[PDB]
Design a protein around this nucleic acid. Structure first.
Ligand SMILES: [Mg+2]
Ligand SMILES: [Mg+2]
Ligand SMILES: [Mg+2]
Ligand SMILES: [Mg+2]
Length: 133
RNA sequence: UCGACA
DNA sequence: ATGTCG
């Protein structure tokens, strides 16, 4: 129905897909950028979306914040729930970095608890997510 | 054979 | 185009 303004919004930007991937997290209310990841040379959109949610979980947990996280990504939301990023991206020397990060994000999920609700941003009703590039 | 989310 | 799920 309506936007939970007291929340963190995450989004991915890329150049190519697969291509250069980055992400950021913003306060949904103020649009202030709370974190921004250095570009990863090769990755997929969905891997970037996954890393952005997991990074948001880590960021909120460290700050003892109970705010929900908004993502526009059906795929990444499911991967986080499963603790398993089911990417098709070839795992080789060029994709080594993104895959290491993905493996580490999954490992964090398997060693930590969180209560953060992970919520689907309703683009069709609300327009583009605020963490949008 | 599609329907969605990016 | 390409990455993904239902
Ligand atoms: Mg997105
Ligand atoms: Mg990262
Ligand atoms: Mg930590
Ligand atoms: Mg976007």
């Amino acid at each position: 129905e309506e936007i939970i303004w007291e929340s963190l919004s995450v989004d991915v930007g890329s150049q190519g897909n697969p291509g250069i991937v980055e992400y950021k997290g913003v306060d949904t209310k103020t649009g202030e950028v709370l974190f921004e990841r250095e570009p990863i040379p090769i990755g997929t959109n969905n891997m970037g979306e996954f890393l952005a949610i997991v990074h948001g979980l880590r960021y909120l947990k460290e700050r003892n914040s109970r705010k929900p996280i908004y993502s526009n990504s059906q795929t990444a939301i499911k991967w986080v729930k499963d603790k398993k990023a089911k990417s098709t991206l070839v795992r080789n020397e060029e994709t080594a970095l993104i895959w290491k990060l993905v493996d580490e994000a999954e490992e964090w999920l398997n060693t930590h608890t969180y209560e953060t609700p992970i919520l689907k941003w309703q683009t069709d009703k609300w327009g583009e997510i605020k963490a949008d590039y």
